[PDB]
Amino acid sequence: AQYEDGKQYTTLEKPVAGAPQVLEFFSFFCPHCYQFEEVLHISDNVKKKLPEGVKMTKYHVNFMGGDLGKDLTQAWAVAMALGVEDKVTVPLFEGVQKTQTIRSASDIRDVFINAGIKGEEYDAAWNSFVVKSLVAQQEKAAADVQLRGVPAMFVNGKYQLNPQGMDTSNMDVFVQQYADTVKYLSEK
């Protein structure tokens, strides 16, 4: 077939009931994730190829970056709780990988302050049980699939995108193949 298990996608030997329709995992330490955000715009190009109103979910992971990796998962929980993901994603990626100015939880907080989140609101969220629950939710989603590596995308709790099997000579051809694969998997 044109789409084959092992080529554009793989199939989970233990499928995950109840998972979000489109679920992405990333780390602010991950070099491909940086490109998926700033240069390839993978999430938006997938969204535009799926029907209106489909749920897409994006979670951070702990396994890169030690202490700061876990701090970034908690900050991503804050960003989700406050609905400011679009305001902090690029400065967090650049602070971790480009300028390397993010070395502590305090440096992470500065990114939110610079983006216009008030300090009192950041701190209240950071320490809230709503955020502790969002951290647990991110861990649980990743654990369900013994998540190996990022960037990872899962479709309907059943299929995992395989970007290693896609074109790499042209950025836009790769993005197109990736998004068309998501569409194909969503229609299975």
Positions in the binding site for ligand 5V9 (CB under 6 A):
32, 149, 151, 163-164, 168, 171, 174
Residue with tokens 């702990």, as numbered in its chain = 62
CB of 116 to ligand 5V9, least distance (A): 32
The residue (of 25 and 126) whose beta carbon lies closer to ligand 5V9 is 25
CB of 127 to ligand 5V9, least distance (A): 34
CB of 10 to ligand 5V9, least distance (A): 12
Q: Cβ(22)–Cβ(51) under 8 Å?
A: no
The residue (of 66 and 149) whose beta carbon lies closer to ligand 5V9 is 149
The residue (of 136 and 171) whose beta carbon lies closer to ligand 5V9 is 171
Question: Nearest 5°: phi and psi at 132?
Answer: -55, -40
The residue (of 63 and 174) whose beta carbon lies closer to ligand 5V9 is 174
The residue (of 124 and 174) whose beta carbon lies closer to ligand 5V9 is 174
CB of 41 to ligand 5V9, least distance (A): 13
CB of 131 to ligand 5V9, least distance (A): 28
Distances (CA, A) of 5 to 1, 27, 50, 70: 9, 26, 21, 33
Residue with tokens 């955020």, as numbered in its chain = 131
